[PDB]
């Protein structure tokens, strides 16, 4: 009865591969080559030749384990609290185990989705007072070594200025040889409303959305460009490929909420239960995500 995560819509089927780990890390090694100097000319006799060097890098992904506790009614004490229609003490907000677990799971899943998208964990609408997480734990919005574009505050309502920064970021994007792949776009609803105005005396032929699709289609070898709207974002746009070779998601198989065996029981009718979930497992190559921030000063 618990709804599916919406983060499944931000990734391709091949981009997600589950791992078996609760808390710990996983390491990957990537090899690379470089040229030291200009090539040597083979004329007459020579033994001093130019060199080609190699370098190695280690990428480590951190996985963290988290828990929540919630109170509910003891199983044997349900019958003394059931009513005509509702089940549970309305005056004191106490629910059976099944109902309490279901609501709690949905809330945790919403938090899990927020972290994957925004890379942070917080319960404040202001977004402050965040939970200090481990390094090597990044989301699609806080990922380092990616293209960041900032729109000036005075041009927040100028769609042309916004599209200008998008083009600048798209130019700086480097897909290498993996360009032939679909693309994914995530916008806030306010941005989505701006995207349906006619393209700019203003034209009456195409829409800003159509121009954006064509512009992205230039760099993805005319591949599909899916657009998604998320209320989580605020004046921010995300563009990144849907290729596993560039961005891959390796979550723990215990990432989604799971009940814990320990149950706190007392002489009264109130019991407590615990839910476990795992955070982490996002890996992305350098300079493959476009992050546009519209300053709302």
């Amino acid at each position: 009865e618990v709804k599916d995560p919406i983060m499944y819509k931000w990734f391709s089927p091949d981009q997600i591969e589950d791992v078996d780990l609760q808390m710990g890390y996983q390491k990957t090694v990537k090899w690379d080559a470089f040229l030291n100097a200009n090539p040597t000319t083979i004329a007459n006799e020579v033994n001093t030749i130019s060199t080609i060097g190699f370098s190695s890098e280690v990428v480590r992904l951190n996985y963290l384990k988290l828990q929540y506790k919630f109170r509910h009614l003891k199983q044997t004490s349900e019958k003394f609290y059931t009513s005509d229609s509702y089940i549970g003490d309305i005056n004191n907000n106490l629910l059976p185990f099944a109902q309490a677990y279901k609501l709690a799971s949905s809330e945790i899943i919403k938090l899990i989705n927020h972290f994957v998208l925004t890379g942070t964990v917080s319960i404040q609408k202001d977004g402050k007072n965040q939970k200090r997480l481990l390094p090597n734990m990044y989301g699609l919005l806080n990922m380092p070594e990616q293209i960041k574009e900032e729109v000036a505050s005075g041009d927040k309502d100028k769609m042309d200025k916004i599209f200008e920064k998008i083009e600048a970021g798209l130019s700086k994007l480097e897909l290498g040889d993996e360009f032939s792949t679909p693309m994914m776009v995530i916008v806030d609803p306010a941005t989505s409303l701006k995207l349906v105005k006619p393209y700019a005396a203003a034209s009456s032929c195409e829409k800003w959305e159509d121009v954006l699709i064509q512009t992205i289609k230039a760099i993805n070898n005319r591949e599909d460009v899916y657009i998604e709207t998320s209320n989580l974002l605020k004046h921010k746009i995300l563009i990144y490929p849907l290729n596993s070779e560039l961005i891959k998601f390796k979550p723990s198989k215990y990432m989604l909420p799971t009940p814990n065996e320990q149950v706190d029981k007392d002489s009264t009718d109130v019991a407590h239960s615990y839910i476990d979930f795992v955070l982490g497992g996002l890996l992305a190559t350098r300079k493959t995500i476009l992050q546009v921030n519209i300053k709302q000063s």
Binding site: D32, L35, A37, T51, P135, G176, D177, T285, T288
Partner: protein, 153 residues
């Protein structure tokens, strides 16, 4: 901090699309141009003399000689590589010329360079000629392409 291979791990995969300016890293061991007829010697390392001029240092006598970062009249060679597990520094004798990136004291091509007391190159005995301008890798780490041709007043 100063080791050839950084101990801190990398958060993201590198983008292997460009092929320019990808050799100016401190991990680049050896020389840019290397001949098959070069003489190279390993020695016990005192401190971390990697990519620095080295000099012979003697203990009391219980243990063998070692090499430590240094220059001046005591300069013996150039450390082009180091193995941290065994603490062995690969040293090229001063009698053999070398062309590679070396630590520069914190400079244009053609400038004359000599080694200081800490095994770092500095502008002017003349020992090597700078082949490029200083490249900064850290607030105090400066490397430079140089070619060493022994000792000459």
């Amino acid at each position: 901090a100063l080791m050839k291979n950084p101990q801190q791990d990398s958060g993201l995969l590198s983008n292997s699309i460009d092929f320019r300016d990808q050799n100016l890293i401190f991990s680049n061991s050896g020389g840019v141009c290397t001949s098959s007829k070069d003489k190279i010697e390993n020695y016990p390392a005192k401190g971390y003399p990697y990519k620095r001029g080295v000099k012979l240092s003697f203990g009391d006598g219980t243990t063998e000689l070692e090499v430590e970062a240094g220059g001046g009249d005591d300069l013996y060679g150039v450390c082009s590589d180091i193995d941290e597990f065994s603490g062995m520094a690969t040293v090229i004798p001063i009698t053999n010329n070398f062309t590679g990136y070396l630590t520069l004291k914190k400079v244009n091509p053609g400038d004359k360079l000599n080694f200081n007391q800490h095994g770092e190159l500095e502008k002017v005995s003349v020992n090597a000629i700078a082949l490029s301008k200083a490249h900064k890798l850290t607030e105090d780490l400066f490397i430079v392409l140089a070619s060493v041709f022994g000792n000459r007043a």
